[PDB]
Subunit: 313 residues, 4 copies
């Protein structure tokens, strides 16, 4: 597999490059960034190769500036982590538009070298995925973002740790925006295939506290460690692996939705999606509880209220 | 880890020995059998080691008679596959009575050498696990059987392949007898954490035909291939790996039930159970639908009908 | 990846189907065999699938008869296991089956042929001939398994992990096999740099290696797990383009002094294009003379 | 397995905590650091758990100050990463004497809680491993350091990439000091078990350039990326995996040598070693060329010079 990471110089990008290169399926990793970081990206490559000696793997790691994008040719997936972080004062809309410009330019330049999938990781992830689809011209099967996937996994760990089960034993889901308007789906939470509502502990579950903790999780990591890198990279690798082996898996990712749900249309939002070799091959239609569906509609409306201002910027 | 396979000369035993030795956690494998099989088991040892060189793994494989059982000392687990094969005219009770003597003798001898877990694979498995618990004297946590685990996995593959998803995406369960009175738990069937009852293809799911195919799958494999060996070994390795890495996972296995479900007491039957480092650390009590619970109760009545005849044989 | 096993109903074929389907890269496994075996292989497909639920893997396993071979199309590799007799008798009988199957493969698609049937060094030659493929496409297991058995021997004698040893046995998959003590390392450290090489019972170890297979036939009825694991190792090297220096049966066109025009076990660089190179190495005088004798025997049968 | 990473707040410590918790054999990971780092470690734990969800693994990660060390008890291994960073004007002896106090106090305190193995990573690695053995009081088997293991891995990738083979195909070694006096052992360089001296490119091998690049590789990553984190972590995980599964493997690591090589005695230096469940179970005696052995002796003399002045620095 050939995967190009635009923004490997970053925290999440560099961790992602490590986790991907050490995989057997990864054969040609392309580390891209702006010119001033090329030397940094040349150090990263070095470091990665050392790990590849201790893990017993090998790959062909490349390093280039954001001008020569023919290195991106024939790439199966291009992960875009490039973006400006949220400093003090920037409104949600301000960062939305700034990173919209960055990500849309990258998507346009990608679409002009080869026909590939674009895995958007930059925030606002829903709006950036929307701008990526617009500026790439690719199909909806090709453009997707990380969305609320990581929040779903962060909810999964908490449900498991409270229920005394392995993390992988719990399989929950949080659809909607990667933000405060997120909707946790207790209807699609099961532990061993057993709906969580079939256990006597679901009555003792502090769902309100767990959901509050999940909502503020990212800012907590930003404050304690300065930022999350290992978890985001692991989730990215999960999606990439589902693609490389065509594991037709029902994950939750940011996707363009065209009415597969009640009133949800013309928006890139976190949704249940069947991922495989051809990217998002389907937007799975699920039955939601009343509360879940009202919240989902409202969240998508907010996401569209932001998508509007970057569609032509 | 140390695991002793009593009956490694057999089909399932031999496949299990290979798939276990290949694992990193396996460090001492003991292949026990009757004396006339000692030449075969040694010939298996050789074969296994060749494969260990191709996978890059290594383990210390031993071969001994079923009269020298001190080699089993300090074993983490003892997997018992030894048993008579069902023949024409042999009723269910005939096999139960014949193999209860075999498994009870082996469990007795195991208890006299060391204090270990006994993983009974021999059939009728729900009844042989009971005989093993009785004659071993171990705690209810130490003795368990494969039960309906393989049936549940065979149900899983059908639900998944019919829903067009990766097998691992489906997580269904079948509790009850490892036989005709098995009750599949549609209440505990989910696909991606999403209860299958929330999908539109659930109404068009041929549930009755799929359960029919599951109930006859064993006879089918026996008529086409001569017996199942790989899949049973994979399920055995699954349980063994949950034990070794204390993966507190909610599986479906043959276990002694003492009132964790209404009307189900004093029997080894297929039930939901939390497996971890201490074997069966809990018999999880879950909400079953009315039809599922009535079926479970009838199934356990049948199982206890067989258990009473062999308890003192 | 798509891989087809001709003879999956057999021992090695069946175990190899299991070990291959289990892997993430295996996406399409085609099980081929004569018509009378179609029900056995079908049963195999069931058992495999159960194990695929126990390992958490998935694949698309197909079952077809050896008179409907269009399902071999687009295959990355086709492993051919189908196969008072003399050595020449078995060679002559299996040559017909191997050559016919290679022929029918060449008429379906341009793919790689992994010869497992014995005599391996001669059946690989016939596969290449009747296939019409390039020398890089057709290859055989050769002394790969013999080298691995010698590896476990060296390692278990020196008290180290099996993967810590890397020895080789080039030449015939038979009595004229030459073990390369010159190319035996333990941690990359030549075995001749240890105080134990003097105490190594090389004669006994090579005796056991030369009769290893026949003893497995007498004690277990045949080898299935080791052969399948070696086959999986080679298929793994191919799928990920791992340019790895393995010892396999290949056609040699003058890559060693005095040996040519034959498919024999040699040191080779395996990669995405099958055998991408016949590595040329320095052998001690004894090793090269023995390899020449082995080459002439193998060519005598060819 | 229980592993305690002292200095997990650092670069290598954090990467190592991730790579280790992610493995199936890791069941209880203890992340230790000074009090002011306790917040960062608490954040790191969060990151780790998120990764554990995406990898399908799970573990019990703990966080505690460097004053509450009773959590280290029962640890299978204690990786010591804590140390000062080399700075402008800090000489080799300066850093040796400074990190000696840190690692020595940590080794003492570890010995006061439990009898575990100590995996020293802090530099000067050979000297710090010697100080750790001295202050811990443990047997020579229990204390060991990363030494020239990563140097050997970097030499491995270079040899392999020049010979056109997979990295796992090459199995070279570099013994000696993790620094100036390292001796690459071309005697123990094999490619598929074939000594590199049996190939046609051994004559074409740019040995001088490759060894020089390896010798300055560390400062180059330090100047380009600010430090190495992933590769050191992977090597640490390699050694830890050998210890957990009793993989009796012949790795090159920093260990105390008592004459297994001619005259090489009374120092912790990079040596070929047989690692297993009991830590460093043996110092392998191999045949080295004349140049290799003389270089190893020079290296050992340098290491002894540094060990001498920090052996009693509390
Ligand atoms: N769940 C999710 O979807 C999550 C979202 N994210 C998002 O991903 C993005 C990356 O995060 P992280 O890697 O932690 O961030 P860093 O700030 O560490 O790195 C981001 C990279 O973006 C590039 N960059 C910065 N400014 C510009 C610019 N003005 N023009 C072009 N490229 C620029 C830089 O690389 P170079 O200098 O090479 O261009 C920089 O290293 C963030 O926006 C974050 O919000 C991350 C984690 C989770
Ligand atoms: N899902 C499940 O729960 C499954 C249950 N099973 C059951 O497990 C058992 C083993 O199956 P399989 O491995 O296919 O069977 P085999 O008959 O191939 O092997 C069982 C072994 O039992 C030993 N054995 C046979 N008779 C006796 C005896 N009278 N006294 C002592 N030992 C004896 C033999 O080994 P030796 O000659 O060395 O003693 C024989 O190899 C069967 O009863 C089968 O029904 C199997 C698969 C799935
Ligand atoms: N080191 C090596 O290279 C090794 C060599 N081998 C060789 O590979 C071959 C396969 O061994 P194994 O799988 O153990 O053998 P089995 O005899 O158990 O099965 C081989 C298969 O060959 C097929 N077959 C038999 N006769 C014919 C025929 N007349 N025409 C077509 N197909 C036929 C059958 O499958 P179907 O009925 O589906 O055709 C049968 O299952 C043997 O010759 C063995 O010597 C095996 C292991 C290691
Ligand atoms: N091949 C090898 O053997 C290599 C050796 N190393 C060496 O190991 C060490 C780790 O390097 P890196 O991880 O990059 O280092 P960092 O400096 O990033 O982290 C080291 C940690 O040590 C702790 N620390 C710093 N000063 C003191 C002190 N005075 N007393 C106690 N603890 C202190 C800090 O954690 P807290 O504040 O929580 O105590 C700090 O995070 C370095 O000395 C490096 O040279 C690294 C890589 C390879
Ligand atoms: K790779
Ligand atoms: K093992
Ligand atoms: K597969
Ligand atoms: K773990």
């Amino acid at each position: 597999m050939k995967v190009t990471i635009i923004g490997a110089s970053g925290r999440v990008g560099s961790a992602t490059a490590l986790l991907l290169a050490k995989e057997s399926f990864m054969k040609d990793l392309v580390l891209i960034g702006r010119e001033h970081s090329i030397n940094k990206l040349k150090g990263l490559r070095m470091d990665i190769y050392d790990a590849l000696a201790g893990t017993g793997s090998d790959a062909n790691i490349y390093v280039e500036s954001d001008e020569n994008l023919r290195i991106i040719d024939e790439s199966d997936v291009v992960i875009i982590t490039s973006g400006v972080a949220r400093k003090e004062g920037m409104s949600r809309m301000d960062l939305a538009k700034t990173n919209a410009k960055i990500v849309g330019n990258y998507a346009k330049k990608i679409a002009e070298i080869c026909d590939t999938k674009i895995f958007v990781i930059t925030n606002p992830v829903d709006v950036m995925t929307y701008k990526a689809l617009v500026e790439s011209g690719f199909e909806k099967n090709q453009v997707f973002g990380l969305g609320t996937h990581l929040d779903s996994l962060r909810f999964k760990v908490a449900i498991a740790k409270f229920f005394g089960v392995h993390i992988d034993e719990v399989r929950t889901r949080i659809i909607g925006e990667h933000g405060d308007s997120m909707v946790p789906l207790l209807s699609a939470t099961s532990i061993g295939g057993i709906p969580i509502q079939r256990f006597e502990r679901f009555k003792e579950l502090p769902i309100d506290e767990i959901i509050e903790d999940v909502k503020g999780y990212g800012k907590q990591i930003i404050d304690l460690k300065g930022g999350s890198e290992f978890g985001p990279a692991a989730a990215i690798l999960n999606v990439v692996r589902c693609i490389v082996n065509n594991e037709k898996r029902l994950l939750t990712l940011s996707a363009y939705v065209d009415g597969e749900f009640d009133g949800i249309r013309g928006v890139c939002i976190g949704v249940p999606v069947k991922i495989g070799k051809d990217g998002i091959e389907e937007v799975v239609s699920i039955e939601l509880n009343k509360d879940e569906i009202i919240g989902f509609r409202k969240s998508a409306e907010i996401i569209k209220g932001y998508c509007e201002e970057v569609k032509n910027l």
